[PDB]
């Protein structure tokens, strides 16, 4: 009977995020000497050049983590992360200017990424 003003009484169960979307696990290494922290909703292929991973596996995807959270890579750290698929129109504009259109144009995204030294193309 103790009253905590404004308290919640949440229902039973758990909330599944990004339900029904393909999930992909990839290994990513911070090859730089400063920490990199990546948010839930950044097009994964457009992250910091010094993160080494299979860049093609980042296309049309983002981290499969709760909205507004992040994955952290200390200098020299390699670990696995799980990605989910982008939704909506599956278009990305701006950010690193690697896509600027449909995420379906994988060859163009990778060509731009390789030319600008984003580690891990092919």
């Amino acid at each position: 009977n103790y009253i905590v003003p404004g308290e919640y009484r949440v229902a039973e169960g758990e909330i599944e995020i990004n339900a029904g979307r393909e999930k992909t696990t990839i290994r990513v290494s911070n090859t730089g000497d400063r920490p990199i922290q990546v948010g839930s909703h950044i097009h994964f292929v457009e992250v910091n050049k010094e993160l080494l991973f299979d860049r093609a596996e980042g296309i049309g995807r983002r981290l499969n983590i709760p909205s507004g959270t992040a994955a952290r890579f200390e200098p020299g750290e390699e670990m696995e992360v799980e990605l989910t698929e982008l939704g909506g129109n599956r278009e990305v504009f701006g950010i690193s200017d690697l896509t600027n259109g449909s995420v379906d144009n994988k060859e163009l995204i990778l060509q731009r990424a390789k030319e600008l030294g984003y580690k891990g193309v092919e």
């Binding site: 009253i3 905590v4 003003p5 308290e7």
Partner: protein
């Protein structure tokens, strides 16, 4: 005196704390604004005494206990924040979960 805007406002915190202290001394369980005023004034007077920010983050958790306050008050106060002039200038003190 050359009172600035913050000095005038912060006088009213001291006053609210004096009020609350009188209420506590005559045996009342304190409420939300009363508890916040007491702990806030404690921090600002601590700064005036020349205590460090680290001392006041520690001491602030022992100013009031749950038996001093009404039911629910401990859980209503997630933290108490106050800025005051220490010997080395204005600093922010936050006392986290002051009343257990």
């Amino acid at each position: 005196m050359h009172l600035n805007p913050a000095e005038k406002e912060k006088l009213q915190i001291f006053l609210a704390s004096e009020l609350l202290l009188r209420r506590k001394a005559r045996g009342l369980k304190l409420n939300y604004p009363e508890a916040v005023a007491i702990i806030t004034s404690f921090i600002m007077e601590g700064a005036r005494d020349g205590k460090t920010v680290a001392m006041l983050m520690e001491e602030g958790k022992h100013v009031l206990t749950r038996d001093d306050v009404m039911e629910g008050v401990p859980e209503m106060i997630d933290d108490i924040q106050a800025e005051a002039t220490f010997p080395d200038g204005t600093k922010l003190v936050t006392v986290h979960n002051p009343i257990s």
